[PDB]
Write a protein that holds these residues in place. Structure first.
Motif, PDB file in Angstrom:
ATOM      1  N   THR A 175      66.637  24.646 120.292  1.00  0.00           N
ATOM      2  CA  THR A 175      65.657  24.066 121.200  1.00  0.00           C
ATOM      3  C   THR A 175      65.794  22.548 121.198  1.00  0.00           C
ATOM      4  N   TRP A 176      65.681  21.952 122.386  1.00  0.00           N
ATOM      5  CA  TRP A 176      65.692  20.505 122.574  1.00  0.00           C
ATOM      6  C   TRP A 176      64.447  20.086 123.342  1.00  0.00           C
ATOM      7  N   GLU A 177      63.925  18.910 123.009  1.00  0.00           N
ATOM      8  CA  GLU A 177      62.761  18.356 123.688  1.00  0.00           C
ATOM      9  C   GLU A 177      63.172  17.061 124.375  1.00  0.00           C
ATOM     10  N   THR A 178      62.975  17.003 125.689  1.00  0.00           N
ATOM     11  CA  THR A 178      63.242  15.799 126.453  1.00  0.00           C
ATOM     12  C   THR A 178      61.996  14.923 126.503  1.00  0.00           C
ATOM     13  N   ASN A 179      62.116  13.798 127.213  1.00  0.00           N
ATOM     14  CA  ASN A 179      60.985  12.926 127.506  1.00  0.00           C
ATOM     15  C   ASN A 179      60.584  12.971 128.975  1.00  0.00           C
ATOM     16  N   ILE A 180      61.024  13.988 129.716  1.00  0.00           N
ATOM     17  CA  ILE A 180      60.798  14.076 131.155  1.00  0.00           C
ATOM     18  C   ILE A 180      59.587  14.962 131.415  1.00  0.00           C
ATOM     19  N   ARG A 181      58.552  14.411 132.050  1.00  0.00           N
ATOM     20  CA  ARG A 181      57.383  15.223 132.371  1.00  0.00           C
ATOM     21  C   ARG A 181      57.773  16.291 133.389  1.00  0.00           C
ATOM     22  N   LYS A 182      57.637  17.562 133.002  1.00  0.00           N
ATOM     23  CA  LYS A 182      58.114  18.648 133.859  1.00  0.00           C
ATOM     24  C   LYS A 182      57.432  18.633 135.220  1.00  0.00           C
ATOM     25  N   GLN A 183      56.120  18.380 135.241  1.00  0.00           N
ATOM     26  CA  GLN A 183      55.344  18.350 136.477  1.00  0.00           C
ATOM     27  C   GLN A 183      55.683  17.159 137.361  1.00  0.00           C
ATOM     28  N   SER A 184      56.469  16.206 136.866  1.00  0.00           N
ATOM     29  CA  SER A 184      56.848  15.044 137.652  1.00  0.00           C
ATOM     30  C   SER A 184      58.157  15.228 138.416  1.00  0.00           C
ATOM     31  N   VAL A 185      58.868  16.343 138.226  1.00  0.00           N
ATOM     32  CA  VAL A 185      60.133  16.573 138.917  1.00  0.00           C
ATOM     33  C   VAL A 185      60.031  17.858 139.731  1.00  0.00           C
ATOM     34  N   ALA A 186      60.899  17.965 140.745  1.00  0.00           N
ATOM     35  CA  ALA A 186      60.809  19.074 141.696  1.00  0.00           C
ATOM     36  C   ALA A 186      61.417  20.362 141.156  1.00  0.00           C
ATOM     37  N   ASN A 187      62.483  20.257 140.372  1.00  0.00           N
ATOM     38  CA  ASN A 187      63.115  21.400 139.721  1.00  0.00           C
ATOM     39  C   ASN A 187      64.143  20.832 138.751  1.00  0.00           C
ATOM     40  N   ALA A 188      64.851  21.725 138.064  1.00  0.00           N
ATOM     41  CA  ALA A 188      65.868  21.320 137.099  1.00  0.00           C
ATOM     42  C   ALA A 188      66.908  22.426 136.980  1.00  0.00           C
ATOM     43  N   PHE A 189      68.055  22.071 136.401  1.00  0.00           N
ATOM     44  CA  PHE A 189      69.156  22.997 136.183  1.00  0.00           C
ATOM     45  C   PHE A 189      70.047  22.381 135.114  1.00  0.00           C
ATOM     46  N   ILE A 190      70.960  23.184 134.570  1.00  0.00           N
ATOM     47  CA  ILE A 190      71.805  22.771 133.455  1.00  0.00           C
ATOM     48  C   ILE A 190      73.261  22.939 133.864  1.00  0.00           C
ATOM     49  N   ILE A 191      74.062  21.895 133.649  1.00  0.00           N
ATOM     50  CA  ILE A 191      75.500  21.955 133.894  1.00  0.00           C
ATOM     51  C   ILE A 191      76.193  21.474 132.631  1.00  0.00           C
ATOM     52  N   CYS A 192      77.080  22.300 132.077  1.00  0.00           N
ATOM     53  CA  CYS A 192      77.865  21.893 130.909  1.00  0.00           C
ATOM     54  C   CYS A 192      76.975  21.313 129.808  1.00  0.00           C
ATOM     55  N   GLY A 193      75.816  21.934 129.588  1.00  0.00           N
ATOM     56  CA  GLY A 193      74.936  21.549 128.502  1.00  0.00           C
ATOM     57  C   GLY A 193      74.068  20.340 128.761  1.00  0.00           C
ATOM     58  N   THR A 194      74.114  19.778 129.965  1.00  0.00           N
ATOM     59  CA  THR A 194      73.263  18.665 130.353  1.00  0.00           C
ATOM     60  C   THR A 194      72.216  19.160 131.342  1.00  0.00           C
ATOM     61  N   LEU A 195      70.949  18.864 131.048  1.00  0.00           N
ATOM     62  CA  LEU A 195      69.856  19.159 131.963  1.00  0.00           C
ATOM     63  C   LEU A 195      69.746  18.056 133.006  1.00  0.00           C
ATOM     64  N   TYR A 196      69.655  18.449 134.274  1.00  0.00           N
ATOM     65  CA  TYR A 196      69.446  17.541 135.389  1.00  0.00           C
ATOM     66  C   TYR A 196      68.151  17.905 136.100  1.00  0.00           C
ATOM     67  N   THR A 197      67.457  16.892 136.623  1.00  0.00           N
ATOM     68  CA  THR A 197      66.248  17.094 137.414  1.00  0.00           C
ATOM     69  C   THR A 197      66.424  16.521 138.814  1.00  0.00           C
ATOM     70  N   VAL A 198      65.613  17.035 139.742  1.00  0.00           N
ATOM     71  CA  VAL A 198      65.590  16.590 141.129  1.00  0.00           C
ATOM     72  C   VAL A 198      64.240  15.932 141.399  1.00  0.00           C
ATOM     73  N   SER A 199      64.265  14.806 142.122  1.00  0.00           N
ATOM     74  CA  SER A 199      63.106  13.915 142.194  1.00  0.00           C
ATOM     75  C   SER A 199      61.995  14.435 143.101  1.00  0.00           C
ATOM     76  N   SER A 200      62.347  15.167 144.158  1.00  0.00           N
ATOM     77  CA  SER A 200      61.426  15.525 145.228  1.00  0.00           C
ATOM     78  C   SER A 200      61.869  16.850 145.825  1.00  0.00           C
ATOM     79  N   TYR A 201      60.894  17.656 146.245  1.00  0.00           N
ATOM     80  CA  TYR A 201      61.169  18.903 146.947  1.00  0.00           C
ATOM     81  C   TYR A 201      60.986  18.785 148.454  1.00  0.00           C
TER      82      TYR A 201
END
Ligand SMILES: [Ca+2]
Ligand code: NA
Length: 259
Positions: free
Chosen positions: A173-199
């Motif tokens: 398990t890993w804990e980020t500093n990104i507020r989940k409710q502040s991003v539109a969605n997320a996904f993982i590529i090659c072990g890196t989590l990415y977020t999208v700013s707006s839906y």
């Protein structure tokens, strides 16, 4: 090969839902297909409403794009929101009004495993920014199965755990500093989590990254277009190396480039 995300292409619309039941949903393919399925097999779930159980299965991409399903599954328990994935023959989905992930083996129509995601918020505690009870988001990448969520201990920051796909045990398990409710969605590529700013925006961005291999967080400014202004689902498929998304009735895909 693997690398950092550096570019996202234009969304391509592959199918448009014809009823309000498909305003939001999830569609996916299996990056590790197993008999009797192939890399063309596609699954579609229209997820509006309160008793979502129908999974449309298509043997061929042509059927997914132009025709009727080749089979309809009725799940044994209703499903929550848009975060489900298919991996190595099973649909992994969240039970409605629960923090339970369910492994449903598609060929046998059998539940093989269930697991409460420890401490995970659910049913509107830590959704993505559009709401939709998107508290728990499953993900597949090059290394296998993950789950994206948050907890009270993490104060709503995105948490991600690697999952055993057979029994749903949490492996790390890993804990980020990104507020989940502040991003539109997320996904993982090659072990890196990415977020999208707006839906909603045509001019959104992939705006944060968290590398589980190094623990480093970054900001990004990679353009991301919500062509239809309401993206409910954004996932990555590591076999196709593409993003799969659901945007205001439309099942869309985006090409990517890695460094
Ligand atoms: Ca996602
Ligand atoms: Na997902």
């Amino acid at each position: 090969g693997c690398g950092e995300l550096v570019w996202v292409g234009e969304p391509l619309t592959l199918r448009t839902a014809e009823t309000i039941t498909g305003k939001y949903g999830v569609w996916m393919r299996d990056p590790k297909p197993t008999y009797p399925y192939t890399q063309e097999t596609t699954w579609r779930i229209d997820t509006v409403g309160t008793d979502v159980r129908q999974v449309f299965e298509y043997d061929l991409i042509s059927q997914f794009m132009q025709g009727y399903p080749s089979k309809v599954h009725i799940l044994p328990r209703p499903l929550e929101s848009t975060g489900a994935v298919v991996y190595s023959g099973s649909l992994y989905f969240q039970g409605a009004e629960s923090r339970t992930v369910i492994r449903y083996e598609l060929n046998t129509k059998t539940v093989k495993a269930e697991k409460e995601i420890p401490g995970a918020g659910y049913h509107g505690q830590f959704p993505y920014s559009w709401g939709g009870y998107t508290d728990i988001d499953l993900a597949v990448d090059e290394a296998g199965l993950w789950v994206i969520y948050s907890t009270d201990e993490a104060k709503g920051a995105i948490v991600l755990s690697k999952l055993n796909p057979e029994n749903l045990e949490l492996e790390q398990t890993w804990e980020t500093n990104i507020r989940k409710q502040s991003v539109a969605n997320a996904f993982i590529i090659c072990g890196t989590l990415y977020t999208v700013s707006s839906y909603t925006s045509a001019d959104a961005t992939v705006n944060f990254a968290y590398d589980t291999g190094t623990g480093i967080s970054k900001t990004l400014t990679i353009p991301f277009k919500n062509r239809y202004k309401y993206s409910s689902m954004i996932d990555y498929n590591p076999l196709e190396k593409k993003l799969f998304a659901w945007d205001n009735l439309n099942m869309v895909t985006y090409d990517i480039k890695l460094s």
